[PDB]
Every structure is written in C-alpha cells, then in structure tokens.
Amino acid sequence: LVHVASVEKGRSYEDFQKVYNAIALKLREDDEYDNYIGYGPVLVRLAWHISGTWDKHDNTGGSYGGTYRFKKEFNDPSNAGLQNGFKFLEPIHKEFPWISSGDLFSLGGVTAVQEMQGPKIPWRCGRVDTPEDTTPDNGRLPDADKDAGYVRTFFQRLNMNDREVVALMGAHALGKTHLKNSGYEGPYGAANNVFTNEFYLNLLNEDWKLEKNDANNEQWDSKSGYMMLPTDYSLIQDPKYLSIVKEYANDQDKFFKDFSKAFEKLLEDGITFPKDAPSPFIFKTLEEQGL
C-alpha cells in the first residue's frame, strides 16, 4: 500500500491560503458554538481523529483518503461529536470544491491551531480521496480509561515516541469533554480556546481528586474545576512522561516546537511525497494578512 501525494491540479500556495482564510474567517464569526468556545477545538480533534486511524504495519488508515466522509468512519463511536466540525467545514468545501477532503479536514486543524494562537504548523497538500472500500473499520482510536502503558503502546502504532506523545497530548488544554459524546464531563464550565502549555501546568499544580462521573467512568477532578482523563493523568504517573511534562510546563517555546513537528508528522503519516512535490507551506494567519 502506497499513497502518493498528488497536488490538486493546477493549484498553488495562494490557492491554499484562501481556503485557510475562509476557515479562519469562519472561526472568527461562529464564536457562539459550545458556549462561546468556538470551533477551534473541535477542528483540532477532527484532524487528529481522521489521522489516528493509521496503522504503520499495513499503511491502512491515516489522513490520505479522507475516508472520514463515509458512513462507517463517520459513524465511529469514537467519532461522536465530530459531525459538528464537519458541518462547519461543509460550506467551505462548497466554496472550494477542488480541494480533496483529506486536504481540507487536515487543513482545518492547522488553521485552528494557528488562529488560536498556536505555533505555525507546516502543512502539505496532495491527499487523495479514496473509495468507500478503503475506510478502515472502527476501533482504531484510543480509549481514555487506560494508563501509561496503553498510551505508549497505542501510539507506537502511529510511530510516535514518548516525546511526540506528550507534546501531542498538550492539545488537551483545549475545549472540553461532553457527556453525551464520550462519557466524560468537564471542565466545569468555562473552557479554554487559546493554545498554551496550560495542560502541563494544570497537571502539575492542581490537587486532583479521582471520581466517578454520571456516566460511570472515572476522571480526575480538581477543585478549581478542571478535569483530566485517566490517559491524561497517566502522563504524570510515568517516570518518563513526567519529566517531559515538566519540561513543557516550564517552557512553552519548547512545547510549541515539539507540538508543531509532531502534529505535522501525525497529519502526514502514511503519505508518500514524490521528490518533485512542493515544499510544505506555512500559512499566514488572518492577523498577519491584516484581515
């Protein structure tokens, strides 16, 4: 299984900036979503989910084929809630119909992070829509009620080491859990939508109480009103992870750089980029374009 990247016919960087801008402008506009959190968070989640299906052993899954668009993938229970990101992106694809889905789902995540003040994420186009046949079965996404070994194990499937993992988890500083979607509740009830190293700080400085929630699942609840899933908490129970957490707790820059590299890698897993491929583009934010 090879997936070679194929640039959308005749498109160039400027063509992609525009898609980016459209998404960005729309995020700005639709600020009421989920109690005023914005779609930032949800788009980040989408991009990681259409990407975490990848399986380094047989090259199946991954963002290339934009299979999230098919029922089977779209109905993935681990996918609950994601449908709102999709509906967000809808009209945008309608405006730029030559962009493939994998390119769009992925770019939304990128636009998201950056417009939330994250670090820039270099991104490459070229993903190709593949047939329904190629949709991976459900069940390739991680559960949250496990520990550090699980996490370590799970992520190896995607080629990520300790470091990538901890860095990537820092997206957890964003948005929130929704009982109806996954069985977790919190945080109570004003969330964050600015990308900072806030996750690691919360992990180290709060007084976590393990509790069961209304759905019968365990979660770490803090006085201040924050929450962390078991998989999250586990980052502090493992010796190796713990030191990286601390590192990120102390230097947002380091965190941003590693986050950037890992998120890109994550979004490119399984794709093969021909030699003559264009370099990765680095999008300008609205602000930088004075829009």
Ligand code: HEM
């Ligand atoms: C062990 C790995 C992980 C597990 C089990 C996991 C599980 C979860 C859970 C259960 C949700 C809450 C869903 C809800 O009720 O709406 C969630 C929220 C989300 N996850 Fe993850 N997560 C992990 C990895 C990732 C990674 C790598 C990313 C991004 C880089 C990420 C980004 C987020 C985002 C942004 C949200 C908040 C979404 C919202 O506000 O709607 N998580 N994650």
